[model samples]
Target chain A: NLPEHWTDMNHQLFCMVQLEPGQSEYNTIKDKFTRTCSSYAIEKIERIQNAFLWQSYQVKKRQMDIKNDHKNNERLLFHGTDADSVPYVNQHGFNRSCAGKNAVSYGKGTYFAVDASYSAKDTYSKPDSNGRKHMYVVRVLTGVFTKGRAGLVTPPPKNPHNPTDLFDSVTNNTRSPKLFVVFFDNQAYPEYLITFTA
Target chain B: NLPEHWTDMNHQLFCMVQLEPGQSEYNTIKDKFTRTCSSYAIEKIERIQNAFLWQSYQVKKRQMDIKNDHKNNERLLFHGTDADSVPYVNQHGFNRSCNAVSYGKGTYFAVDASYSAKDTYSKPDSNGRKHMYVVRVLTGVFTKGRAGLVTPPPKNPHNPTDLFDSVTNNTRSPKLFVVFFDNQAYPEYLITFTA
Candidate 1:
């Protein structure tokens, strides 16, 4: 289902392959597309990877406060150990401060939202002591807003109970400073033009 | 102030130059650090730049939707563009997205979040408009995590707004049969043990 005005520069075609199912049709189409756009797609994918990794490290370093014993080795394993996992790692030094407030930290040093997809596994050959593997398949993605250098003018204070104060502090001011703004509308430019024009 | 536990990698000594604000400490430090960390920092700086450009494009794209066109190209001119304002061509087609939802719509492409920054400029200049720049600087780093995938779990329409829901048809669940997990971390072995 292609959008009416979709064009090459504005659109990218990708398939999320459930490679485990061994679905011949799915794999065939996915493989064909991969073969076709491998060079171009892979390069951008690498950039996204680099961007994701860089943000992860910076956030972890900014948020986590770990003791020296775990200092150099303080590692947060991404994509938990599961058959469908895509792993990531972050250090406490950078991510400590931001992460203390929220799982997804916002601001100049923080880059993205880590969305965890939860799943329950029934009876695997090798299961944890619980005998059931309850899992979270997470993907790090772009956040609602980017954090620029001025830092968050008003991040919610490290205080927990007064989160409303944080929201009020952010939303009331003419410029909330580093608050992230979500972009959710899905419409083409000129067409989007008509809706707002009136 | 230094951390209590000091090591060779953590220790560095540099001459301190004290100057009045009226003096040129900004230039002095800029030139010196530019000489020392320029090559490596440049890459991170470029990443910040790339992130900003992406943000600008997204903002502009949205601005058009909001019936607000403030002559952005000229807006840059008025702001006195700096390295951060440097425009990069999207030759790589980096800011485009195509999928089932977007259905090949390029509008889904957005700027990378790391480069967004908040900025301010004192006093009006040129066109008598005070300058303010909001920028997101790229702090060079990324974190890693692992997740699981499953399907046919359950269906709960009433739990639409629930922040945490395991079984919901509101979102598409990838069909499950065979599972292939991949490690997407880069420069895998290196660890950031210290601040």
Candidate 2:
């Protein structure tokens, strides 16, 4: 049979408890582990909590949050979400054109975005019997969320009649140059990688 | 114009270089960044050299491998994998049957496997919008990899009709019962989903 408070333990804490043997107050500790799993939980039960326990809880909660965030980010990348566009800026303080048939761009001001059905496509491999066209693999370059500052945005004017007018509007309304990573299939391999920063 | 070695840098390193303003190697680094932008460049430079750079490279490579592995594992759980079944054992030092339905139980043991396509399916909300259904689903109390000390083999008459006979053959296998977090069960709800 399962332990009494097993329901209260998160996967990590549950795994911890499962691997840990010999505990007197298994139920009480399980409750504590659950509370400690959340940042707010420490304050919720302040009436009976001590400083050391609270500190420990906070530490564990932060670690769990980071782990959870990383996993969630991976999911988002794999299944491409609704485009959240942001301005695409360039190094020279100019907004590069995201416009044109061959132009590259993504949603502005947010992390990179891919089409809902985007998949790595390659030609070297035999056509998928299942008819999966996009065989390309995608991954976020490290530091994307933290030190990284790049994203996808809708394409902009390819060739504005008045370059100055376009520059003026872009300068006034959007942020500067940004980078974007694009993955796809090259003729030689099953997958290929590329990037765009404007 | 793009930098020379611009292809050498991965997205992270490229982003790093792009953000950095002043450096003698800035132009060189930028070129490397661009080259790395292609999966091909990685293969081309398979023949190359670097020291403090090489050490750093190795460290970063290993770190990337571990990170990738963990993410892949998460993907596996989010979506079930092909049932590349092998022997499964139980905590009682018995080999459990992974054979015909109802012969044994889950929480069995074996090496990890991957699936071609996996995704979590859920019920919709009152508005027919996407939402979480199987809020929590749990499987396998523990890994048969470690805890299980048995496996399957031809049943001998002494325990013929006894599924436990299959347990005997798995006894000497060195593999241990390792725990895998199969998410989504009420009892296992602490790690439950909010969405």
Candidate 3:
């Protein structure tokens, strides 16, 4: 069964399907967060069904053409943002101007973390008046990342030998990245909105 | 003709036709603005035609079911917004949350008087560049609006079931109306005036 609001999908910007604790997606995503932020409790989870964002992501994903690559370098990551901006980000995706809000250590770009604990921090995810914080389980393409340096806006060129080919993304660790950053807006999908208490 | 960099209709966000001094739409919009804020002359005017926007508007317009009514109660109105938000409003249509605010949660619009349009564009934004859109709003089945009202009250008090199409502080038969749905309006002109 679907909510009455769900049926009238044409008007709303994004349609949503909320996940219950009993559901597979619900428990799996919950574990992904609580695995890192054990202290917090997730209040609600809604999968974001934004066709426009998906279309944009699909175009970029096809261009990368990494069909044979493992996991296609695509992973579900967490992005922390403020309450007021949640709507804007949903409508337009992430605007990279918000590069250094948390830290620019891994270059200036939109940031995502595999560890929900890192993003759940107040500095990244600001709390609302009611103490509820918002984060997105973003579909990020962290393809072919290199260790990032400070003040670098876009990902660096792959190597000196081939200055033309640029890296797709940047991260804190080239081998085991705790954080990944994307320079382009379409590289990620704001796949789910998680409202929680931290 | 489609301007430079303009592409095919189906997938693109909008097709812009930048109006030169001699163009008709440009002159009229400029006159409307200059009539109120003559001090700040307009620099340019661009007409926006997005198939998506029109498609959305037509869907709502058909639902209004008030066609024989004057202009189908459709009117061209003004909405002032920040430079950054102009692109979003143009593409996504007006989000009611933006103007929420004062006259119920509906998106606010200023009527024919460019003076009210100036008040609509009351403040400059972060970039100090100002823009006001000329939008075509479907003000079907309107009612007197008050503050804090999110949606319009019912058209028939006796029935009290069917809601009004829009809300307005037009008690004095004056210049204001607010519409709830994004498709209720089509942003027709984006005028660049001095902030």
Candidate 4:
């Protein structure tokens, strides 16, 4: 049986560290975030990345996959890292905020590559307007520990799309944190005491 | 456009007070909580009370509406004032911590007739349950304040039916209040609040 209170068990803290492949601290940060087996951590991250890709594809397809609409037959192009600017828009004409829009993109610069032997049916891949095929990329760099309640610790009536509004809300409500953490049990999911150095 | 922050508005606090007829301090407490006229406050309170009653009726109906179920046919009685013991239970099989497991056949004390002939389905009646009394005495009392975010200040898995376990959890987490109140009798009123 599970303990009456789970927080009392064992706690481990992990930080979200970013590193480039050839960087000096890359290997060290990777190893720290990884579990006992290094490959297991990589595979877990890949799995999470793929889930996000599949979800994005499904959402896009729902908007574009009409039976007889000529506009629906068009190909949606997603570029690789360092590729030229790609013009992408949803069915409602709201362009991908990351590509051309000046608006802030949360968690920018993170990259998740498509696996080898990708297919349009399986992965988020499709031919470009020029008839060349390309698999999509997801730029998500954060690694989350999913053992606790995760929510934006801000005031009510928030407009997440507007960064300035969100920032102002947090600044106004001095009590609310940017991110709040409450562990179910102290054991396996340990309580974290976050401190800012600068 | 709206105010940049709505919380900055003038927040007039209110508290629920109960008193008997001709009580000296009734007007003082009443004016403090009331925004406008005296009758307006009474109307608002009655509306809130009736809403609670209707909601209670609906919740009770859902639990007891099943056909051929042995437990569905039972009439769960809820008393208005301080009775000896009242047997209460949730829609689930969890028994209420408040009541006794008997009937009130011969203990019917005469108070006043029903205030109005209002029914869930029919019109008002001449019964004492419908007559408006001078609230002879606030057999029960509770207070509430209207402002700011209101919720249990701490995180503790609590089962409302198990009062002992709930108390223990609160005690374990010292930050969590055993009985929290911003207004008078709020804790007492909260005790009567069925989950």
Best candidate (score: TM-score): 3
CA lDDT of each prediction against the hidden true structure: 0.21, 0.22, 0.72, 0.21
Measured with C-alpha atoms, the lDDT of residue B48 in candidate 2 is: 16
* Candidate 1 wrong stretches, greater than 4 Å: A1-51, A54-63, A66-136, A139-155, A159-198, B1-23, B26-195
- Model 3 score (lDDT): 0.72
Q: Give the range where candidate 2 chain A is weakest over 10 consecutive residues by summed lDDT.
A: A85-94
Who is ahead in TM-score, 2 or 3? 3
Name the top lDDT candidate: 3
- For model 3, the superposed segments whose C-alpha errors exceed 4 Å read A1-13, A66-71, B1-195
lDDT of 2 by residue, A95-144 (tens): 11221211233323212323212222121112234432221122222111
lDDT at residue B51 of model 3 (Cα atoms): 58
lDDT of 1 at A166: 22
What CAPRI-style quality would you assign to candidate 3? incorrect
Q: Tell me the deviation in Å of residue B36 in model 2.
A: 31
lDDT of predicted model 1 = 0.21
**iRMSD of all candidate structures:** 16.3, 25.2, 12.5, 21.8
Q: 2 or 4: which has the higher lDDT?
A: 2
TM-score of decoy 3: 0.49
The segments of candidate 4 whose C-alpha lies over 4 angstroms from its true place after superposition are A1-198, B1-49, B67-195
Cα-based lDDT at residue B39, candidate 3? 71
Candidate numbers, best DockQ first, in rank order: 3, 1, 4, 2
